[PDB]
Amino acid sequence: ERGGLAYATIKYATETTIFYLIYNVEFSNTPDSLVLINPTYTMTKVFI
Amino acid sequence: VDMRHLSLMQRRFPDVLIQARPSHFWKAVLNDSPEAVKAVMNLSHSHN
Amino acid sequence: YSTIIKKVRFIRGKGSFILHDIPTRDHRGMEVAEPEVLGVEFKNVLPV
Amino acid sequence: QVYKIVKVPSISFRHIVMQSRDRVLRVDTYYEEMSQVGDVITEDEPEKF
């Protein structure tokens, strides 16, 4: 809320995920399952 | 033994494990338990 | 004398209070006081 | 009861083929199972951690 102790609050840790993408080749018959409308970016990165 | 090992692991890594009080350790180890023990201990700690 | 006795009665009645369940916060495994329990107000100087 | 009796050991490793022939991917199910059982952690409450 405006004029409080702080402008905004932050949760330092939230839900984070790591994914492994292997597209099925048959799904290329219907490209709508694997095509994005516009180019995008990926932000997070995790090292193990 | 869980209390002892939790204290030891807290002492092992001070930079990445935050500080804690024994009450928090006891609450955490009591939460994950068969709940007959949880119920009787809750009643006892409510009485005294 | 009525003003004098009214003022001393006000002084007596103002300072009679008992603390009960003050708000607290957990920090570094200890208990710390939330800004409103202590009698200092500094809302105006923070943004400047 | 503290332990259990079983007939077959639990699966541990599985494989994925990327339509290719020379190489495949080997993955461990134990890491996935360990990842899926946890919970969101916040520094504010040590008890949850």
TrEMBL record, chain D:
Domain of life: Viruses
Subcellular location: Virion
Listed name of the protein: VP3
Organism annotation: Bluetongue virus 1
Gene: VP3
Span of the entire protein shown here: 78 to 126 of 901
